[PDB]
């Protein structure tokens, strides 16, 4: 019931609304005869113009062997004496986005931390189902430990970083290793930008989202439809994070929310049950900021504190 | 998990633990494999006990037609020149309660009201399913307001009220009554204690709920089932009543939320968004409470005092 929310663009803050206001006239608009692939593209188009000027540094490309075939891994390194690897994965609701879409974010991440980040390009739904994605991650970041001297990077320490579906495939990958109990690394710190972790309501949820960040709860079904197998896997403790034991051995999780954003429950619900187990873990909430904030970081303050404090978080742990 | 949950039994007040911690040896124990009789006949007898001393007035029963039969109904009258009825709908999940389980409630209603109260004893499920309650509610009410000089009450203003499920029908009768345009009488108020309002899942409800309420996310599904006829009135707006328009004449609404309490989200997320449209709304919390606080009102007066809220909030409007 579109009525019943919150007005958004009147209420968040001034940087935000610059963002909003912003034009990109050579772009089409957005797909209504929606072929995935055209909404792929258009992201991808959207997307680059806000990653622009991003920093400069070594980067690499390697190609990773999963169950599923090869996975792309690119790698960020921005000194040579990296004393962890942080994993990267992107958010776009499962079906959208890749490793240009977040360039930026990465290298940001990686300038801030000043450790190796390795984004995966982890198959796309509905290609893809869970939980193919988090098996490509957890097998990626198992190699790099196997082999870490072979990339000369320092896999003795990991962490696992996302946004959004992002997050979700974060944190998932995290207590997938734990409970498979591999050592992969030491999952020193997870950090996790409004993620979703398997919440099917929310007071935020029926308060907040609509065209203006396409988070509907219609949208949301949608997202969920392309990518789960199985409507049993909505319970699943790898989808629906709070089905999972949250109470021991929960990596450092740095969880940010964004202001109005209709997931901002689904972070906060995790950070009160991380503290209620004596977890450890952080809660920050963005004032002023819809959904996806942290690709504004060229025009947004409050964008790029976001990485550098999820990247102090990371080393504050090492 | 269960486990996720915070510990509710250490966290509450000191009143509420006196609650907690009384015996009645008389009673058998709570019959979870038994008929759906047995829980109805366990929760009349264990709710007997809390009803004890309740205000003596001038009582009487009607029975009220409506397309579903005949519909039992009490009339609790403190004075001859009411300014107002006042309709209390009793909670137990749509599958329990009765007029004599909430009798102590709607005669202390009555007494802090100075309003005639009239208790509706709906039919309940799953014997009767969604809508049926709500059109016995809404039939039994217009029978009154065209009947009213008959029964010798005031039905130029009328309220409705009750706890938890009970909230849900006095919401969603007086939102029938305004969507149909109707006059059955100027709604000068909902009071609504704990209720639920068709959130699916919210932080509350993840991190509270166990055996100590009988409120886990199994029990409440478990209603819920019993309670609706066809799947899709999941998203109806007079179950879902978010789904309903909350922007527009709604009367005004006490909302009552009890702290320890897996629904308190459904009353936080109702006081957010009629505040949100500039809808006559109050909103309070009771600290240190378990949902069904309520009926504890000769042992706590955190009990009694959301008994005379309400009751003033409702005198209030007149």
Chains 1, 2 share one sequence.
């Not at 320490?157 to 996302?162: K, L, M, P, S, V």
């Not at 974060?170 to 999952?187: E, F, N, P, T």
Request: negative net charge; hydrophobic residues 40%; aromatic residues 12%.
């Amino acid at each position: 019931k579109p009525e019943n929310k919150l007005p958004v663009l009147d209420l968040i803050s001034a940087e935000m609304k610059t963002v909003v206001n912003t034009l990109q006239p050579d772009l089409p608009p957005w797909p209504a005869t929606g072929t995935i692939a055209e909404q792929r593209q258009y992201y991808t188009l959207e997307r680059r113009f806000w990653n622009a000027g991003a920093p400069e540094m070594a980067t690499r490309a390697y190609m990773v062997p999963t169950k599923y075939g090869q996975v792309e891994t690119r790698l960020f390194c921005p000194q040579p004496d990296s004393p962890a690897t942080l994993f990267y994965l992107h958010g776009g609701g499962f079906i959208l986005g890749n490793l240009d879409t977040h360039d930026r974010i990465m290298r940001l991440l990686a300038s801030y931390s000043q450790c190796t980040v390795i984004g995966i390009d982890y198959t796309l739904s509905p290609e893809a189902r869970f939980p193919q994605a988090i098996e490509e991650i957890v097998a990626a970041c198992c190699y790099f430990h196997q082999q870490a001297e072979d990339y000369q990077i320092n896999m003795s320490r990991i962490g696992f970083a996302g946004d959004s579906a992002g997050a979700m495939l974060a944190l998932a990958s995290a207590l997938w290793l734990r409970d498979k109990q591999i050592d992969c690394g030491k999952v020193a710190g997870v950090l996790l930008w409004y993620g979703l972790y398997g919440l099917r309501d929310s007071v935020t949820r029926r308060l907040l989202g609509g065209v203006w960040d396409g988070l509907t709860q219609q949208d949301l079904q949608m997202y969920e439809e392309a990518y789960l197998s199985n409507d049993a896997d909505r319970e699943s403790p790898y989808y629906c994070l709070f089905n999972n034991d949250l109470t021991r051995e929960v990596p450092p999780c740095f969880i940010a929310g964004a202001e109005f954003d209709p997931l901002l429950d689904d972070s906060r619900l995790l950070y009160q049950t991380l503290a209620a187990h004596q977890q450890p873990c952080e809660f920050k909430l963005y004032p002023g900021t819809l959904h996806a904030f942290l690709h504004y970081s060229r025009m947004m303050k409050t964008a790029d504190e976001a990485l550098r404090d999820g990247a102090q978080f990371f080393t504050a742990q090492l």
